[PDB]
Amino acid sequence: MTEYKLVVVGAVGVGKSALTIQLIQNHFVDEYDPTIEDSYRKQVVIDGETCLLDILDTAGQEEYSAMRDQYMRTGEGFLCVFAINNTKSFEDIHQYREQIKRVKDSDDVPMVLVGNKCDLAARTVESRQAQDLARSYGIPYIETSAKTRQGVEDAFYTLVREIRQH
């Protein structure tokens, strides 16, 4: 069975854990320990292919585990997440991308830019702003809501499809 190693990165509070838990449990967690970092597994069929997603939900910027290092080095694709009502998290994307490019020694790394919490009113980051950032990286942009599930499968499945074009 094909396995796809995905890593979810982005600022604290953007909904990395909520997105991951939504994908695996079909539930929205209103609070989830911000320090728990763990990998999760999900068997899924994507475009007629039965495959396994191996997803590290990264947490914190304390000194990385061997596992986090391993996932950064061996991860095949990255979900770079900000929240549409969190301008700083969006501005921080640059750093997460620079980090990924550094670890992969490449500017050609499967990656999807995710604008999460799209169920909330009065966003401070416009869709077009994020579209422009993603375009500058040569990557897709997808809006999601871990709360309503909108876009959540599309974000993870698009990243699989990006890995397959690699």
Ligand X SMILES: Nc1nc2c(ncn2[C@@H]2O[C@H](COP(=O)(O)OP(=O)(O)O)[C@@H](O)[C@H]2O)c(=O)[nH]1
Binding status of residue 153 toward ligand X by CB under 6 A: no
Count Cβ atoms below 10 Å from residue 88 Cβ, excluding itself: 13
Could you report how far apart the first and last alpha carbons of the chain are, in Å? 19
Residue from 7, 55, 59, 112 binding Mg ion (CB under 5 A): 59
Strand-pairing partners, residue 25, are: none
Q: Which partner in ligand X, Mg ion, none is near 84 (CB below 5 to 8 A by kind)?
A: none
List of E strands, 26-148: 38-46, 49-57, 77-83, 111-116, 141-143
Contact status, residue 156 vs residue 53, Cβ threshold 8 Å: yes
Q: Residue 98 or 132: which CB sits closer to Mg ion?
A: 98
Binding status of residue 147 toward ligand X by CB under 6 A: yes
Q: Is residue 88 part of an annotated ligand binding site?
A: no
Q: Is residue 60 part of an annotated ligand binding site?
A: yes
Dist. CA 57–CA 1, nearest whole Å: 22
Q: Could you tell me the smallest distance in angstroms from the CB atom of residue 32 to ligand X?
A: 5
Question: Annotated binding site for GTP: which residue ranges?
Answer: 13-18, 29-35, 59-60, 116-119, 145-147
- Contact residues toward Mg ion (CB under 5 A) are 17, 59, 102, 105
